[PDB]
Amino acid sequence: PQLHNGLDFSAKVIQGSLDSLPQEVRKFVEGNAQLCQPEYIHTCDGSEEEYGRLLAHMQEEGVIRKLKKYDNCWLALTDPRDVARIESKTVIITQEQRDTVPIPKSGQSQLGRWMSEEDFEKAFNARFPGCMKGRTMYVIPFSMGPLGSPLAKIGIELTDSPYVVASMRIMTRMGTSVLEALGDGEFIKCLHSVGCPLPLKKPLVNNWACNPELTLIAHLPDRREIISFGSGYGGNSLLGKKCFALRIASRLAKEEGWLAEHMLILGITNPEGKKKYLAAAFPSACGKTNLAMMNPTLPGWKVECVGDDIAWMKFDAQGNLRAINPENGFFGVAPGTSVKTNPNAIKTIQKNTIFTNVAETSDGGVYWEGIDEPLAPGVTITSWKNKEWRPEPCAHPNSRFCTPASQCPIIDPAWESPEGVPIEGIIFGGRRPAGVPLVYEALSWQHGVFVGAAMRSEAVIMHDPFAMRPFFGYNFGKYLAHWLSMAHRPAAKLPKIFHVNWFRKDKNGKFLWPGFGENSRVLEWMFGRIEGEDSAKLTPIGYVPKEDALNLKGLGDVNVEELFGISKEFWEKEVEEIDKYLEDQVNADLPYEIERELRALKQRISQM
Numbered sequence: 001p002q003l004h005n006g007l008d009f010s011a012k013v014i015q016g017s018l019d020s021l022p023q024e025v026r027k028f029v030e031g032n033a034q035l036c037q038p039e040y041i042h043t044c045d046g047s048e049e050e051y052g053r054l055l056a057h058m059q060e061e062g063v064i065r066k067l068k069k070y071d072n073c074w075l076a077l078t079d080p081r082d083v084a085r086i087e088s089k090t091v092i093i094t095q096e097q098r099d100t101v102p103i104p105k106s107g108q109s110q111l112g113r114w115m116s117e118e119d120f121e122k123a124f125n126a127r128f129p130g131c132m133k134g135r136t137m138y139v140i141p142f143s144m145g146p147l148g149s150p151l152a153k154i155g156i157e158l159t160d161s162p163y164v165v166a167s168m169r170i171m172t173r174m175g176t177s178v179l180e181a182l183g184d185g186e187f188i189k190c191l192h193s194v195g196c197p198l199p200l201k202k203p204l205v206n207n208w209a210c211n212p213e214l215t216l217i218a219h220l221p222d223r224r225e226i227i228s229f230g231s232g233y234g235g236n237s238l239l240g241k242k243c244f245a246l247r248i249a250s251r252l253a254k255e256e257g258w259l260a261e262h263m264l265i266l267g268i269t270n271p272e273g274k275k276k277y278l279a280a281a282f283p284s285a286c287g288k289t290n291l292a293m294m295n296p297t298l299p300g301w302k303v304e305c306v307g308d309d310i311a312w313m314k315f316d317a318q319g320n321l322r323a324i325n326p327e328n329g330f331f332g333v334a335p336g337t338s339v340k341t342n343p344n345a346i347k348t349i350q351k352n353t354i355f356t357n358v359a360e361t362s363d364g365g366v367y368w369e370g371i372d373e374p375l376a377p378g379v380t381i382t383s384w385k386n387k388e389w390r391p392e393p394c395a396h397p398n399s400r401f402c403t404p405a406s407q408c409p410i411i412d413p414a415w416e417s418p419e420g421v422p423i424e425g426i427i428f429g430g431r432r433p434a435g436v437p438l439v440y441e442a443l444s445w446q447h448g449v450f451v452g453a454a455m456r457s458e459a460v461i462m463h464d465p466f467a468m469r470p471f472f473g474y475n476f477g478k479y480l481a482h483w484l485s486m487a488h489r490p491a492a493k494l495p496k497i498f499h500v501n502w503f504r505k506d507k508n509g510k511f512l513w514p515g516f517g518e519n520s521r522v523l524e525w526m527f528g529r530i531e532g533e534d535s536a537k538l539t540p541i542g543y544v545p546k547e548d549a550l551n552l553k554g555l556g557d558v559n560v561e562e563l564f565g566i567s568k569e570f571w572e573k574e575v576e577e578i579d580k581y582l583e584d585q586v587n588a589d590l591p592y593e594i595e596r597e598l599r600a601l602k603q604r605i606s607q608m
């Protein structure tokens, strides 16, 4: 069988058995053990005891602190160099560049970062050999989607970070039951290392292992591999989330006829008890989580959360667009969360939650900018830098909570239903301080796809089509064609498409619209429009609410002519910016129908 000990790693297994693994899982584990040279192999079973043991271990190692105020909550503080996703160090590898991004006309692509296989092999070899020396390689078997769902997909993540294991237990369905469901089936291969083999060549900051210089988050869709090095943070290390559920999945979806999108999924119920599901794509830090868990101000209205970040959607045999949330938890921006901006999150995160880079109070609680809560006389604050802090923010602006979805008091009764929830409306939006109205509705499916493609958002006003700029797993031109093709599907029940702007400002630079829970007044209008109410007025950019169509009672000085005003001058500029972007960035792969919508919008604006 072999001539020495060789490639049998059985003797290093501290939990599980290599013999009991499905053979391709075994090969994946053993091959990467040979490569990365971990001291131990720990096959995760997903049990409470394992989780228990692992938190204790991290506490013992000074990697996390227990937050004594709450029930089983923990705080991790990071190296200030490793605090977020980094788009620039994120790449996709294909034989042909054009499969990954459109070939731009004049400029550099901002629709992805392609890397040749040969550049990646050099990069890979400069990073992973020996990279786990002295550490445990954890084998995390995980399901994206409920453990049986026809939309669900299985991954195996190898990692040397117990913080990733713990976070993956919350953010995915993890453990032995996943291996048992996998059998000899296909799985996504996820390899992760913090890139700090022992003994340490460089000094660790705040006991947070990372390698900023060599950080690289790679996707290789044709090998169905995700390979990430150097960062322990969120989207860089929790491979099921962005790398798998958006980048890899979007390419699988294109091939198999479904969608993987940066969308919340919410259930909304009117005072009659009539309920619809909606999906919404906003860019990062633009309000998905606040919307998905909204506490509505309008009496009788209820919002329930199916998911807050990622949607997998597919037309069923009946023509309804079905959506699942493939995550098991919410990895939510901490700062700005308060009892008045997101009371439901406040209720969720007080137990079994891991916080990263927030501040800690002397009585063992958490603090951040915009928490909007007085502390008791005597209580002091340690900032995310492990320094005494008084009113430098006390929490990193991308600090995060990581919390179980099942704990959310408004979690939707169907949030785990294998068949998904039927989508009747899709909402696009971002941060636009000027010009873009509070809400408008697309003229058609094709206009709506154009509206998604035309999305922009203040970081500078960036382009962020479908809120997927950082997450396209393949050519965006082909992504547009894929969306447009959904109108060719027989019997498809195409949802209504809306665009919102919560962030318009006045000359004084303050928000024209109160937002948060008051956004229920906008969802009410959308609900009525889905029902077919004659509550809309035609404008050059699409349908807006008629005068007195929105419930504005009680706000009360809301400048509707400013909120809904449509300036020829602004829109002339806007279409110019959309045109230049699409021509350069999508170029030869821009579908005809999108160019036609551009032309049509330009024409309607010229007639003002």
Ligand SMILES: Nc1nc2c(ncn2[C@@H]2O[C@H](COP(=O)(O)OP(=O)(O)OP(=O)(O)O)[C@@H](O)[C@H]2O)c(=O)[nH]1
Binding pocket: 282, 283, 284, 285, 286, 287, 288, 289, 290, 291, 308, 309, 331, 332, 333, 335, 336, 341, 502, 503, 511, 514, 515, 516, 519
């Ligand atoms: N003015 C205003 N700000 C809002 C509203 N909703 C959310 N925000 C702001 O948006 C930020 C929080 O956004 P998140 O919900 O964390 O963004 P997200 O889309 O969930 O981001 P990812 O989880 O990174 O995808 C804070 O600055 C909030 O003040 C709103 O209705 N009005």
Ligand SMILES: O=C(O)C(=O)CS(=O)(=O)O
Binding pocket: 084, 085, 233, 234, 235, 236, 241, 242, 283, 284, 285, 309, 331
């Ligand atoms: O950046 C985002 O859109 C996120 O949802 C957070 S992360 O998962 O990418 O770290």
Ligand SMILES: [Mn+2]
Binding pocket: 061
């Ligand atoms: Mn030790």
Ligand SMILES: [Mn+2]
Binding pocket: 288, 289, 308, 309, 331, 332, 333
């Ligand atoms: Mn979020």
Ligand SMILES: [Mn+2]
Binding pocket: 262, 284, 309
């Ligand atoms: Mn996101």
Ligand code: NA
Binding pocket: 062, 063, 064, 076, 077, 078, 205, 206, 207, 208
């Ligand atoms: Na730390």
